[PDB]
Design a protein around this ligand. Structure first.
Ligand SMILES: Cn1c(=O)c2c(-c3ccccc3)n3c(c2n(C)c1=O)[C@H](c1ccc(Br)o1)Oc1ccc(C(=O)O)cc1-3
Ligand SMILES: Nc1ncnc2c1ncn2[C@@H]1O[C@H](COP(=O)(O)OP(=O)(O)OP(=O)(O)O)[C@@H](O)[C@H]1O
Ligand SMILES: Nc1ncnc2c1ncn2[C@@H]1O[C@H](COP(=O)(O)OP(=O)(O)OP(=O)(O)O)[C@@H](O)[C@H]1O
Ligand SMILES: [Cl-]
Ligand SMILES: [Mg+2]
Ligand SMILES: [Mg+2]
Length: 1173
């Protein structure tokens, strides 16, 4: 990372953007490398801008009764804004007065205009000086405005993240990741560039006043006709803007919903594949896209007319201005040409610059208002004592989850809870599924506010969640969690949590890079990493919500005896548990039942109780037909224009006066009106944008289909930020920005080519004069696009870390707030912001360099032309000047065309990224009895890696019960996934004589019914979550829910079976989701079932629910039951034990437990009575 050249530069180098030379030379030859990017200027760093805006916003909040964010932004940026606006206005003024000199210079070609031939050289000098000053005034101001806009955007994003970290729990249920992602994605690049157009709300009226004053000279009272036409057109454009904004308002919610569903699906792709649910998800997304595309199409239709307003107004203004003048007296061709010259500037001011500025103000003020409304939301109440007597006490606590029901005080989740615990004691909390154990910890943490009662303690806490949270980084980073590294503590914690055995089996040992969510590890490994993180922190109170759910009895016993009771014997602990052995040595015991305290006391009492354009064009067949139709109409118009033009030169008082020496004006007039003569009407414009929108629809469908069928090895590489970035920003670009940009480019190209051909055919000496300018423009464009494409790719990639950080911050907010690590995460977010800023700044600077170089080349050519024309003009007409000035007039449209081509190529990178995503590789009654045979099965996760399971062979009789067991991290889930071909495999598997190499993947996967270890619940109704294909009547669903035991749970919510679940099922407790998975497995009438720990955190009472069902729901079925619970192993006939990456088979569990002394000694005694009666 080398220092940016901007900081240490020169004044002339800054004015001409010369400091960008080293990068442009470097990327023209080769690929840009890591050491090619500069550090950002210190003024753009996120910390400084965040601090400044935060101070101004706090002053605004603390001073005024009606605060406004726009006031703080003004106090931060107004002076520089006005400073650049003044120079922008001075630059724009020079265009208004250019016809005064150019018109006289052109009139001097006529020998009858003896007066203007006297001072031609002075007019030429003045024109050259004007041309030089305009370039110097315009481009630096535009760069300054872009820089200011970038600074505002960065500051606001920092404020948004800081506010997000403080949101109250009651507010979180109303905002999803989709809404925040949409908010960031919408303003990420548009806000910066709007500032370059903002000043035209007052620059344009002054231009109109000056131009009307100047047109009064030539045509006094007849100019008002054209002005009235323009004032009607402006009203029309205002109305069109209102309709477009109305269409945008109705579309945003549907985009947020689609983003939520897509992110959830791609996160749970493994369950999606195991369920064979791909088509259902595709149908859901297609239904959402169909609703949003209609609004997109209507907005595009209204934007087409708004854009075409400029091109169709050219003929009307001139004709309406001239007709009264040419009727009540004569008119000369010179006056007509001068009127056209002035009217071009007038039309650009009225129909292009002012409405764009008005729309920019609308968009920016709306975004700022939305940000302020977000910034004024309800916050987590931190009001509590940070120092007490270390006697943790809870008195008369009654709590409600529903804010409306609680304020109306709707049933309470907690009712009159009392307890008191001393320093260094242990309290064990027990109860049935859904009793309110997690909710009690929520109250103690302060995330759930009680209506009645109160809780007192010191305030330094540590927290271990039922659902583990893993952040991006290594294992050591996940454990030390942003504080200093201590060797003795780290070793003690690593040893105590039984992690050394799993740590010693990794290539990086401990520096393995864990992704977001820890999908590389098993369930028990993630749980133990979370426990180690909780124990590493020093605090006065440790809350542990059921940390032994995914562990075998031996590991659980070791951890409980060596960590909770030995390593923290002198601290205050609250452990949620259901094992009766753990309750014996608890100092105090609390038992919950349906929100009430069934018992509080002691145990002793309880016993007593470039080929990218071509693909894009050929995606859809109708676009080709539309383009050919446009070309045919264009050819007909060109031919008609040529025929009409040749007639005036072949044919010979009237309203128009033409002399012999003044006829050269005719061609000059044609070039001034071709913009209107070759304008694309609604017979060509509307079908084009319609078909481009259709192309966007097709591309999104293909992208989603391609993603859903990739192999797991490919899918495991992608990050959540990358998925969100590609599906949000690139798709939005393809939907909105590409069609109209393409329309503008095509219109400009048609105008240029038509004018060139028509002029050249009659005068084949202008084409040859225009050749060198065209060549120079093309060479410069080719040179610049070699570096520009790479820089745009880097900037596009730079967005992903921001979204990834936001997603991971949202997932683990409660842990972050409990530990008190908000500043650390804020620093990481600022890092991501700066990383994006470097590339974005480098792209903007190079773009400014290119535009200035094009402008300078045009100026040099015009300066050379003007003096030659004046010099070679003698007593006769200046033929050389006549040809050269007309040639230079045509290049004026070519410059605009080249800039339009640059922005089109900039937008096409999104198409290239979508295509890269589309080309991902594809991973691609018979079940009569249920027999299986496995022969030499080997399994691995990546090709050429460690083999988790090597050379396994066994067989199963049809309709038999098999118990799969092993230590946490052995590879039971690996064997379960190998059955469904979810990883890389070798060997053969046969079901009733049919091998998996004889049929397709879908048919093989349809033979199984599965219960995965990770439960997937998406946004939708209860009914939709139970079956997405809608093939069962509500009677059958209700009967199944009766059998599983989900009656009261479903009837607890206002919409019985129609309630919509949000936040991945936030309202449901942990065991209810397992019950929802068992109901899914029951609804599928599958002959072979693979169940991965169906009872993970259930109490023995609730386990009786899953019992009896395996004996009624699945009677004649082959069941493979992976379980850590010893009781469940009493209903198996075959046993498979995984150890040393190998599988061993047993007939009786007494024989199994005879050969393992430690494991037998770990068995609970009541279980031992049930095993050895
Ligand atoms: C006689 N005569 C001009 O005086 C032209 C001018 C012009 C007028 C006054 C001062 C400076 C230039 N302009 C253009 C001119 N043509 C083609 C022309 O024949 C041409 C154009 C106009 C329409 C399209 Br499509 O392309 O490009 C221009 C692009 C932007 C602007 C801008 O005012 O921002 C003006 C353009
Ligand atoms: N955000 C919420 N809004 C409404 N009800 C909720 C919410 N979160 C939990 N509940 C409900 O509150 C009750 C208590 O659930 P909680 O998760 O605290 O139970 P638990 O004892 O931890 O359960 P488990 O043993 O399954 O882990 C349940 O009926 C649950 O559905
Ligand atoms: N997606 C993956 N990519 C690479 N290695 C993996 C992946 N998933 C698991 N592993 C590794 O493979 C081994 C087997 O893990 P597996 O999930 O099969 O264990 P398990 O016996 O099911 O454990 P638990 O009882 O904790 O669920 C572990 O050491 C784990 O780290
Ligand atoms: Cl003129
Ligand atoms: Mg719980
Ligand atoms: Mg597992």
């Amino acid at each position: 990372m080398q220092r940016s050249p901007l900081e240490k530069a020169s004044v002339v180098s800054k004015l001409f953007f010369s400091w960008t030379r080293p990068i442009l030379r470097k990327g023209y030859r080769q690929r840009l490398e890591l050491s090619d990017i500069y550090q950002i200027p210190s003024v753009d760093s996120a910390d400084n801008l965040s601090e400044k805006l935060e101070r101004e916003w706090d002053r605004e909040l603390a001073s005024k009764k009606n605060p406004k964010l726009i006031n703080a932004l003004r106090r931060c940026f107004f002076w520089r804004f006005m400073f650049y606006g003044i120079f922008l206005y001075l630059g724009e003024v020079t265009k208004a007065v250019q016809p005064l000199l150019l018109g006289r210079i052109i009139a001097s070609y006529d020998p009858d205009n003896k007066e203007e031939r006297s001072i031609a050289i002075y007019l030429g000098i003045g024109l050259c000086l004007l041309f030089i000053v305009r370039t110097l005034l315009l481009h630096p101001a535009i760069f300054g405005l872009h820089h200011i806009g970038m600074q505002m955007r960065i500051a606001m994003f920092s404020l948004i993240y800081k506010k997000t970290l403080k949101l109250s729990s009651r507010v979180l249920d109303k905002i999803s990741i989709g809404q925040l992602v949409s908010l960031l994605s919408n303003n990420l690049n548009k806000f910066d560039e709007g500032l370059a157009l903002a000043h035209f709300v007052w620059i344009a009226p002054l231009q109109v006043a000056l131009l009307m004053g100047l047109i009064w000279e030539l045509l006094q009272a007849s100019a008002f006709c054209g002005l009235g036409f323009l004032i009607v057109l402006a009203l029309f454009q205002a109305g069109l803007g209102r309709m477009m904004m109305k269409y945008r308002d109705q579309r945003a919610g549907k985009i947020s919903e689609r983003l939520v569903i897509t992110s959830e699906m791609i996160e749970n792709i493994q369950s999606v594949k195991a369920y064979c649910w791909e088509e259902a998800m595709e149908k859901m997304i297609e239904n959402l896209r169909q609703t949003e595309l209609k609004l997109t199409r209507k907005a595009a239709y209204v934007r087409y007319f708004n854009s075409s307003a400029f091109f169709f107004s050219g003929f009307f203004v001139v004709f309406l201005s001239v007709l009264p003048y040419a009727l009540i007296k004569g008119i000369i061709l010179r006056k007509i040409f001068t009127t056209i010259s002035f009217c071009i500037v007038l039309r650009m001011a009225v129909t292009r610059q002012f409405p764009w500025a008005v729309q920019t103000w609308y968009d920016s003020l709306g975004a700022i208002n939305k940000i302020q409304d977000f910034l004024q939301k309800q916050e987590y109440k931190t009001l509590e004592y940070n120092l007490t007597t270390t006697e943790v006490v809870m008195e008369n606590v009654t709590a409600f989850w529903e804010e409306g029901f609680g304020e109306l005080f709707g049933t309470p989740v907690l009712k009159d809870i009392n307890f008191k615990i001393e320093r260094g004691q242990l309290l064990a909390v027990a109860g049935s599924t859904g009793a309110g154990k997690t909710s009690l910890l929520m109250v103690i943490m302060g995330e759930l506010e009680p209506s009645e009662g109160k809780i007192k303690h010191s305030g330094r806490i540590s927290f271990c969640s039922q659902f583990s949270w893993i952040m991006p980084g290594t294992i050591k980073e996940n454990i030390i969690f942003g504080v200093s590294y201590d060797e003795y503590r780290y070793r003690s914690v690593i040893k105590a949590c039984q992690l050394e055995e799993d740590i010693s089996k990794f290539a990086e040992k401990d520096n393995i890079v864990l992704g977001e969510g820890g999908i590389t590890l098993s369930g028990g490994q993630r749980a133990r990493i979370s426990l180690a993180r909780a124990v590493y922190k020093d605090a006065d109170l440790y809350l542990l919500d059921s940390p032994f759910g995914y562990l075998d009895v031996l590991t659980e016993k070791e951890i409980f005896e060596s960590c909770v009771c030995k390593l923290m014997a002198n601290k205050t602990r609250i452990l949620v548990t259901s094992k009766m052995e753990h309750l014996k040595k608890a100092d105090k015991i609390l038992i919950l039942h349906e929100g009430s305290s069934y018992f509080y006391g002691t145990f002793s009492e309880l016993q007593n109780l470039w080929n990218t354009y071509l693909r894009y064009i050929t995606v859809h067949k109708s676009l080709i037909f539309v383009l050919i139709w446009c070309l045919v109409i264009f050819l007909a118009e060109v031919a008609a224009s040529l025929v009409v033009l040749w007639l005036l030169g072949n044919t010979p008082s009237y309203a128009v006066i033409i002399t012999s020496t003044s006829s050269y004006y005719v061609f000059y007039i044609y070039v001034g009106v071709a913009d209107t003569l070759l304008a694309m009407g609604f017979f060509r414009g509307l079908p084009l944008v319609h078909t481009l929108i259709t192309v966007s629809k097709i591309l999104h469908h293909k992208m989603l289909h391609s993603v859903l069928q990739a192999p797991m090895s490919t899918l495991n590489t992608l990050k959540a930020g990358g998925i969100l970035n590609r599906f949000s920003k690139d798709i939005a670009i393809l939907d909105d920005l590409l069609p109209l940009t393409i329309f503008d480019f095509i219109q400009l190209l048609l105008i240029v080519i038509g004018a060139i051909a028509v002029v050249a055919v009659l005068q084949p000496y202008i084409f040859v004069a225009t050749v060198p300018v065209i060549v120079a423009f093309i060479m410069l464009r080719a040179y610049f696009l070699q570096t520009s494409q790479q820089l745009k790719q880097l900037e596009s990639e730079g967005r992903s870390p921001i979204f990834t950080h936001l997603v991971t911050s949202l997932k683990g907010l409660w842990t972050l707030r409990a530990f008190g690590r908000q500043p650390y995460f804020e620093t990481l977010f600022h890092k991501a912001l700066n990383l994006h800023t470097a590339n974005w700044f480098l792209y903007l600077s190079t773009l400014r360099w290119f535009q200035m170089r094009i402008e300078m080349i045009f100026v040099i050519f015009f300066i050379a032309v003007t003096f030659i024309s004046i010099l070679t003009t003698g007593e006769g007409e200046g033929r050389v000047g006549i040809i050269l000035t007309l040639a230079m007039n045509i290049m004026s449209t070519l410059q605009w065309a080249v800039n339009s081509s640059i922005d089109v190529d900039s937008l096409m990178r999104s198409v290239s990224r979508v295509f890269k995503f589309i080309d991902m590789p594809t991973e691609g009654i018979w079940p009569s009895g249920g027999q299986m045979t496995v022969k030499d099965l080997t399994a691995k996760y990546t090709e050429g890696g460690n083999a988790i399971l090597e050379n396994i062979s066994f067989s199963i009789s049809p309709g038999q019960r098999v118990g799969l067991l092993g230590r946490t991290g052995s590879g039971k889930s690996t064997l379960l996934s190998a059955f469904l071909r979810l990883l890389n495999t070798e060997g053969e598997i046969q079901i009733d004589g049919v091998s998996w190499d004889s049929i397709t993947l879908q048919q093989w996967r349809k033979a199984f019914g599965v219960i995965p270890q990770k439960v997937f619940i998406f946004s939708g109704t209860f009914r939709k979550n139970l079956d997405p294909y809608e093939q069962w009547s509500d009677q059958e669903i209700w009967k199944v829910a009766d059998e599983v035991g989900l009656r009261s749970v479903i009837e607890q919510f206002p919409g019985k079976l129609d309630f919509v679940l949000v936040d991945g099922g936030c309202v449901l407790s942990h065991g209810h989701k397992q019950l929802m998975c068992l109901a899914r497995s029951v609804l599928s009438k599958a002959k072979i079932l693979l169940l991965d720990q169906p009872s993970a955190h259930l109490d023995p009472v609730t386990y009786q629910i899953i019992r009896r069902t395996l004996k009624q729901a699945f009677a004649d079925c082959t069941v493979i039951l992976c379980e850590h619970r010893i009781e469940a192993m009493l209903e198996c006939q075959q046993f498979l034990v995984i150890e040393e990456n190998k599988v061993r088979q047993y007939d009786s569990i007494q024989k199994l437990l005879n050969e393992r002394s430690l494991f037998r000694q770990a068995i609970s005694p009541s279980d031992r009575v049930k095993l050895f009666p």
